[PDB]
Amino acid sequence: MVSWFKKIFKKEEKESLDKGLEKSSQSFFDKVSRAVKSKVDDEVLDDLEEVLIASDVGVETTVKIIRRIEERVARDKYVNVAELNNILREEISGLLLENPHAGTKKPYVIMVVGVNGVGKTTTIGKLAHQFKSEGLKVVLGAADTFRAAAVDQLVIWSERVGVPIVKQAMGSDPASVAFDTVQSAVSQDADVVIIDTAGRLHNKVNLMNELSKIKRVMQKVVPDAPHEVLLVLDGSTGQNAFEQAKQFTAATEVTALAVTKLDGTARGGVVIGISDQFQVPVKYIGVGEKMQDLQLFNGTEFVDSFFK
Amino acid sequence: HHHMVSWFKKIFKKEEKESLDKGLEKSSQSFFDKVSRAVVGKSKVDDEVLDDLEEVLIASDVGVETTVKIIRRIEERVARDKYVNVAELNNILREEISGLLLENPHAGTKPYVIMVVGVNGVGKTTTIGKLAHQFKSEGLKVVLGAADTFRAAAVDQLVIWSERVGVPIVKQAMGSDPASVAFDTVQSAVSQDADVVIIDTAGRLHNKVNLMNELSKIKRVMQKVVPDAPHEVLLVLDGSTGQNAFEQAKQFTAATEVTALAVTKLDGTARGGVVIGISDQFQVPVKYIGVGEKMQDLQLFNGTEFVDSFFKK
C-alpha cells in the first residue's frame, strides 16, 4: 500500500543515507552488542526492547517491533544472535509499510512551519536549490517578519541559490508578505512558492490564527494554496521532536514532515516511530550538509541503512 | 511562607548535595551550551529570547506542556519586573522553575509493603537493592520478594542483592505463580516481624490487559495478609532515555495505581531535564532520583534542590 517518495537511489544518495545514520546505527549496535550471548532467547528480546527504547524508536513503536520479532524467533529451534541485524531490518521495514498515511494548478505553494532552531530556513534553501535544479521557477517569501535571523538567512539562501525573495521590513504583517509573495509569483509565472512562517508552541492560539490568516490571504490569489504544509522537526532531539510534532499537527493542518539533523545524532530512530505512528507522512530527512542531503523519504531504505 | 508541597528530603549533607550537583552536571552543561545561543546579540529578555528558550527546553527533554508553563511564568516575571536583563536569565530560570515545581499538589509528602513496578532491566533490580541497603542501614528489618518469576535474570540479580545487603529473599522456581511469591513474601515478613517488604513484579508493556490483571491479582493476594498492602507502588523509570521515560510512565500509571516514581541513571545522561517535566505533569510524586553508582546515590527527591543543581551558577 505504501509508495515511498524516493524509489530509486543513486549510489551517492545511498552512501549519504548510510553515513547520515551511521552515528545512530553504531550507537544501536553498541547497545545490542553489550546486551549479549549465543542464542536469541527472551532475555535477549527483553534487552533488545530496552535498547530500542533507549534509541528513541518510541514506546508504542518498540512494542509492535518486539511483538513481531518475538513471533518470528518463536518459529525456529534456535536463532543465533548474529541474526539480529537481519531480523530487525526485515520486521521494521514491514511495519513501516503498514501505515496507510506513509508515502505518497501552478504555482505550487509550500508553507513551511515549525519552531525556531529546528532548521527551517536551511530546509527552505535546500528545497529551493533542488526545485531550481529541476528547471522550476521558485519564489521565496519571508513571512517570519519578527525574527531578523530568519529573514537574513533566507536572504542569503536566495542569493546563494539564485531565486527571488519577497520580504518586508521587520515587524510587518506576515499575511501581507505572504500575499505579496504569491501575487508576485503569479505575475512572474513561477512554478513553486515557498513561504517561511513564524513558529512557537507557547501562545499556540495566536500561532494557529496567524497560520490560518496566511492561508486565507494566499487563497485570494491561489485558491488551492497552500498545496503543502511542511512541518520541520529536529531529529537530533529524538522523541522530543515526536511530541512537538503531535502539538503542531493538532493545532493546524500539516501535510508532510521533514526531519532534519540526523547525521550528528544518535537518536535517528525517532524517524521510525514517527513514520509508524503519525497520520502525516515523513517526506524529507536531513542526512548531511549537502543540498542533496535533504532526501525524499523511503522507509525501507531508511531501515536498511539504520541496521547496516 | 508555608508550601503545600513538602519535599521528601529537606536537608542535604554536603556530600549528598555534591553528588546531586555532579549527577546533574552533564544535563546542566548541555542546557547551558544550548541557552547560550538564545541570548546572542541580546541585552533584554524579549519575545525572540523566549522563543529560543522554548526550543532549548524542548531539546532538553523538559517536555512541551512543562516548557510552555515555564515560558508563561517567565513572561509574567518580565511583566512584573517590567524588563529582565539576559544576564539575570539563569537566576530567573532557577526561581521560576523552582516555583513551578511547588505548584503540583501531587508532588512531595507494619510491614510497610513496597510493590515495585516498571519495565525489565538492571535499573529496577538495582533500585530495589539500594533501597534495601538504605532501609537496613536505618535499622529496619527488610524482606525481598522476587515476583518476576519468568525472568531468570531479575530473580538471580535480586538474590545477589539480598546476599550483598544481607536481607532475606522469598523466591520460587522459574515460571512459578507471581501471586504465590507475593503471598509467601508478605506472610514471611509478618511472621518475622519485618519492617519493610519490597516486591519486584513483572512489567512487560506488550499486553496492558494482562499487566493490569497480574498487578491487581498481586495486590489482592498480598491484601489477604496485610489489608493495607501495598503501602507504596513504586514505578522505576530510566531517566537516561529522557522524554521516553515520560511516555513509559504514562503507560504504567494507567495500568495500575502507582503512588511514587523513581527516575534512575541521571548522572550519565544529558536528558535529565525530563525530571522537571515528570514532576510538573504527573499526578504521582517523583520520590527517588538516581544520580550515581553509590548506594546513597538513590536520593529522596527535592525539586527545589534539583533545580538549584540543574541550573547551578
Query: Cell match 545514520: residue?
Result: A21
CB contacts under 8 A, B 102-161 vs A, are 119-121, 151-153
* Cell triple for B258: 502507582
Q: Any idea what the Cα angle at residue B14 is, between residues B8 and B20, rounded to 5°?
A: 60
> Which among A236, A240, A265, A277 is the top mutation candidate for probing chain B, defined by the most B β-carbons within 10 Å of its own β-carbon?
A240
> How far apart, in whole angstroms, are the C-alpha atoms of residue B148 and residue B119?
11
Burial class (CB in 10 A: 0-12, 13-18, 19+), B230: buried
Range B77-91 burial, b when 16+ CB lie within 10 A, else e: bbeeeeebebeebbe
A206 in contact with B, Cβ within 8 Å: no
Closest chain B residue to the Cα of A150, Cα to Cα = B48
Chain centre distance of CA A300? 15
Fold held by B112-311: Rossmann fold (3.40.50)
**Is A94 annotated in some ligand binding site?**
no
Resolution (A): 1.9
Residues in B closer than 8 angstroms to A67, CB to CB, are: 206
Tally of residues, chain B: 313
**How many Å separate Cα B113 from the centre of its chain?**
18
Give the fold, CATH level 3, of A108-307. Rossmann fold (3.40.50)
Q: Which of B193, B134, B142, B164 is nearest to B16 (CA)?
A: B134
Q: How many CA atoms lie within 13 A of B219 on its CB side?
A: 19
Q: What gap in Å lies between CA A252 and CA A256, rounded to an integer?
A: 12
The SS3 of residue A60 is: helix
Q: Cα(A284)–Cα(A294) distance, rounded to whole angstroms?
A: 6
A residues 249-308 near B, CB within 8 Å? none
Nearest CA in chain B to A58: B244
Q: Does A244 touch chain B (CB under 8 A)?
A: yes
Amino acid at A257: L
Strands A138-142 and B298-300: unpaired
Q: Are A81 and A54 in contact (CB under 8 A)?
A: no
In terms of Cβ atoms closer than 10 Å to its own Cβ (0-12, 13-18, 19+), residue A23 is middle
CB contact under 8 A, B247 and A202: no
Cα nearest neighbour of A49 on chain B: B120
Distances (CA, A) of B126 to A32, B78, B150, B201, B295: 20, 44, 18, 14, 9
C-alpha cell at B13: 549533607
Class for the domain spanning B14-102: mainly alpha
Nearest Cα of chain A lies from the Cα of B6 at a distance, in angstroms, of 29
In CATH, which superfamily holds the domain spanning A11-97?
SRP54, nucleotide-binding domain (1.20.120.140)
B-facing residues of A in 66-105 (CB < 8 A) are 66-67
The phi and psi torsions of A267 (rounded to 5 degrees) equal -105, 20
d(CA A160, CA A152): 12
- Alpha-carbon span B233 to B79, nearest angstrom: 42
Beta carbons of B172 and B180 less than 8 angstroms apart:
yes
Instruction: Please report, for residues A24, A73, A89, B235, the alpha-carbon distance to residue A301 in angstroms, rounded to integers and kept in the order given.
Output: 15, 23, 10, 38
Give CA torsion, residues B186, B191, B197, B203, to 10 deg. -20
**Inter-chain Cβ pairs, chain A and chain B, closer than 8 A:** 93
B224 is an annotated ligand-binding site residue: yes
In the numeric block, the cell 493545532 is attached to A251
The yes-or-no answer to whether B14-102 and B112-311 have a common fold is no
Query: Is A239 in CB contact (< 8 Å) with chain B?
Result: yes
Contacts of B151 (CB under 8 A, 6+ apart): A42, A43, A46, B120, B202
* Nearest beta carbon to residue B244 from set A59, A118, A200: A59
| Distance from the B283 Cα atom to the nearest Cα atom in chain A, whole angstroms | 20
Q: Which residue has the cell 502507582?
A: B258
- State how beta strands B298-300 and B286-290 pair: antiparallel
Look at the block and give the residue holding cell 552533564. B26
Residues of chain B in contact with residue A261, where contact means CB-CB under 8 angstroms, are none
Cα radius of gyration rounded to whole Å, chain B: 21
C-alpha distances (whole Å) from A234 to each of A21, A151, A168 are: 14, 20, 28
CB atoms within 10 A of CB A50: 20
Chain B residues lying within 8 Å of A201, measured CB to CB: 54, 58, 64, 67-68
Q: Would you call A278 helix, strand, or coil by DSSP?
A: coil
**Where are chain B's structural domains?**
14-102, 112-311
